[PDB]
C-alpha cells in the first residue's frame, strides 16, 4: 500500500538512451545515446541546454560532475571524454580500456572516477593527478556492467558483472572485501546502494528476470522481486520515498514497496525497451528519469 502521485514532467523522443543523470542544482537531465550523441535538457523549460556528437559509437555511460561544471562520458570506442557544459570545451579524451565502457561512477567528494568495462576490470582515475590510472581492480570473469560507490562509505564500491557476482572493494586493496554469488544465473546488469544510513542494503538486476536485495553486513539475500517479463536493466532505491524503481526490456517501469517488496505500480511509458535510470540526487520533486529505445521521460512522484 502506498499513495503515488506520478506526474510526467517532460518526455522527448530520441535515439536509444543508454545513460541518464540529473544535475543537482540546475533543472537538467543528461542523456547519452546509442548513436554517439549526448544531450542536456532543461526539463522545466523543455529546451535543450547543449548537445554534442561525441563519437559514432554508443555512449553507454554519462554523469554530471557538477562541482567542476563537467559531464563525463564513456563509449564503445573505448574512450572516456570530459566536456565543460558551460563552454562545450573537451577537457580530456583518453582510451580508458581496451574494450567497451559500460558504466561510470563519480566519487561524492574526491576527484575519483570509476569505469567498468567488457575488459573484465574496474579502473580508478584521479582527475587531480592528470587523470592518472590509480588502480585496476581485477577478479571478475565477464563484462563489468555497473559500478557504484557506497554513498555512506565511498572508500568502498560495488561492481556488478555478467559472471553472476557482485564484488565490493576497498580503494587501495586488490581483492574484494567480499563477493556476492547472486544466484542470478544470466548475470548481473546493475548494482545500486540504498542511500540512507538506516539500512546496509544493495540491489541487483539480471537478465534472469529477477531483482535481489542484499544486506552487505550479513551478505544475505533479503528479498527477490519477480514480475518483469524480460531482461531487467536496472533497479534502484529512491532517495526519499520508500520505493524501488526498476526498468526492463519488457518496456515497463515498476515501482515496488521497499518494506514489503511487492509491486505497487507498473508503467508503460510507450518508448519500448527501458535501459537506464536516474534519481534526482537531492530528491527534488522526487524526480526520476529513465532512458528507452525511443527517448526519455522525467517523472515527478508523490
Amino acid at each position: 500500500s502506498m499513495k503515488l502521485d506520478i506526474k510526467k514532467t517532460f518526455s522527448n523522443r530520441s535515439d536509444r538512451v543508454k545513460g541518464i543523470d540529473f544535475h543537482p542544482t540546475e533543472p537538467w537531465v543528461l542523456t547519452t545515446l546509442y548513436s554517439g550523441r549526448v544531450e542536456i535538457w532543461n526539463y522545466e523549460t523543455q529546451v535543450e541546454v547543449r548537445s554534442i556528437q561525441v563519437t559514432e559509437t554508443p555512449v553507454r555511460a554519462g554523469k554530471f560532475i557538477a562541482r567542476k561544471n563537467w559531464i563525463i562520458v564513456g563509449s564503445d570506442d573505448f574512450r572516456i571524454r570530459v566536456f565543460n557544459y558551460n563552454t562545450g570545451e573537451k577537457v580530456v579524451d583518453f582510451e580508458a580500456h581496451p574494450d567497451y565502457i559500460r558504466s561510470i561512477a563519480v566519487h561524492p567528494t574526491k576527484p575519483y572516477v570509476l569505469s567498468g568495462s567488457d575488459d573484465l576490470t574496474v579502473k580508478l582515475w584521479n582527475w587531480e593527478n592528470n587523470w592518472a590510472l590509480e588502480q585496476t581492480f581485477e577478479g571478475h570473469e565477464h563484462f563489468v556492467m555497473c559500478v557504484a560507490f557506497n554513498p555512506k562509505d565511498p572508500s568502498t564500491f560495488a561492481s556488478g558483472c555478467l559472471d553472476r557476482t557482485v564484488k565490493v572493494w576497498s580503494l587501495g586493496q586488490s581483492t574484494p572485501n567480499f563477493t556476492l554469488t547472486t544466484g542470478q544465473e544470466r548475470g548481473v546488469n546493475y548494482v545500486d546502494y540504498y542511500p540512507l544510513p538506516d539500512k546496509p542494503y544493495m540491489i541487483t538486476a539480471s537478465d534472469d528476470l529477477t531483482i535481489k536485495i542484499w544486506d552487505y553486513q550479513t551478505k544475505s539475500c533479503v528479498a527477490t522481486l519477480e514480475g518483469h517479463m524480460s531482461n531487467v536493466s536496472f533497479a534502484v532505491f529512491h532517495p526519499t520515498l520508500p520505493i524501488i524503481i526498476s526498468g526492463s526490456e519488457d518496456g515497463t517501469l515498476k515501482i515496488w514497496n521497499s518494506s514489503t517488496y511487492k509491486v505497487e505500480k507498473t508503467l508503460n511509458v510507450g518508448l519500448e525497451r527501458s535501459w537506464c535510470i536516474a534519481t534526482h540526487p537531492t530528491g527534488r520533486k522526487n524526480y526520476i528519469a529513465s532512458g528507452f529505445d525511443n527517448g526519455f521521460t522525467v517523472l515527478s512522484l508523490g
Partner: peptide, 7 residues
Amino acid sequence: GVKLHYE
C-alpha cells in the same frame, strides 16, 4: 566476435 549486450 559476438558481443553480448550489444544493444
